[PDB]
Design a protein around this ligand. Structure first.
Ligand SMILES: [Zn+2]
Ligand SMILES: [Zn+2]
Length: 45
DNA sequence: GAATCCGGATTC
DNA sequence: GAATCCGGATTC
């Protein structure tokens, strides 16, 4: 089953997409803002 | 349908 | 082998 964000790390607590990282910039990506990506979810599923 | 986890293809 | 581009799939 797919994991949920931890909700507590600094990226999880950011309120908005940064608007300028690769994920916020690239027009075809479905990846979350790099500044928001949950630290826990960076571990391999 | 939006958000975005997740993993395949490319490219190095 | 792995970072990056990319988009299928789930969960709401
Ligand atoms: Zn961003
Ligand atoms: Zn988190």
């Amino acid at each position: 089953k797919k994991r949920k964000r931890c909700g507590t790390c600094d990226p999880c607590r950011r309120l908005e997409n940064c608007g300028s990282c690769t994920s916020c910039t690239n027009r075809r990506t479905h990846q979350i803002c790099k500044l928001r990506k949950c630290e826990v979810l960076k571990k391999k599923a």
